[PDB]
């Protein structure tokens, strides 16, 4: 995020980090329950990647984080890689997340819910702060 | 480029798809929602994470960080997967697995 600010630690408890086998953060995701994470299809997650829950500072070794294996990647088969449309994948975890103060689920909307242009929302992540 | 160690946040507004098309043209599909162009931007490495809106006291996943300006320009809208268009598939997948 460019021109954002640091979050209160633990205050976005659904936010996960997707890390590759080398430990590199490459994408975010959101817990929707103890067994499932929603992410983008174009992130190209595989069962060799790891879901990291409960993290704030990726340079700290003192946070009680959960490194969760991925059992299966469910890419939405409406995903169109040419247009990047329907850009959603579900990750089924091999072992459940343990919910806590710092690890819990985001709500999902109904298909008929209205989120009007002009509404102020929030986005979070460990993406670049400067290109 | 700068990658942060610490989790970042930003508040930003939703756009209409019609207005977002003034920036991105026919790249904008019904299963996308734009947000930003407001002095902040999602950027590389944010992809897959949440765009949440607070409704009746609870944060709800409205978008998934998807794509946008190749320079993360804060005057251009970011593009997010529109969760309302995708949630039936989420529920079907959970139910079947």
């Amino acid at each position: 995020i460019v021109n954002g600010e640091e979050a209160v630690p633990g205050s976005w408890p659904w936010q996960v980090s997707l890390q590759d086998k080398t430990g590199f953060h490459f994408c975010g995701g959101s817990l929707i329950n103890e067994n499932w994470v929603v992410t983008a299809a174009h992130c190209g997650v595989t069962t060799s990647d790891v879901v990291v829950a409960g993290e704030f500072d990726q340079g700290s070794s003192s946070e009680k984080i959960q490194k969760l294996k991925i059992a299966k990647v469910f890419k939405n088969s409406k995903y169109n890689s040419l247009t990047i449309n329907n850009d959603i994948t579900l990750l089924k975890l091999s072992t459940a997340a343990s919910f806590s103060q710092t690890v819990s689920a985001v709500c999902l909307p109904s298909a008929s819910d209205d989120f009007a242009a002009g509404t102020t929302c929030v986005t979070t992540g460990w993406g670049l702060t400067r290109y | 480029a700068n990658t942060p160690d610490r989790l970042q946040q930003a508040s930003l507004p939703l756009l209409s798809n019609t207005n977002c098309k003034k920036y991105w043209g026919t790249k904008i599909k019904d299963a996308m929602i734009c947000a930003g162009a407001s002095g902040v931007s999602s950027c590389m490495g944010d992809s897959g994470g949440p765009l949440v809106c607070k409704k009746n006291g609870a944060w709800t996943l409205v978008g998934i960080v998807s794509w946008g300006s190749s320079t993360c320009s804060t005057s251009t809208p970011g593009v997010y997967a529109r969760v309302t268009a995708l949630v039936n598939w989420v529920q079907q997948t959970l139910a079947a697995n």
Partner: peptide, 10 residues
Amino acid sequence: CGVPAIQPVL
């Protein structure tokens, strides 16, 4: 869902 134990501050 949707109600963090640690409230965010924007």
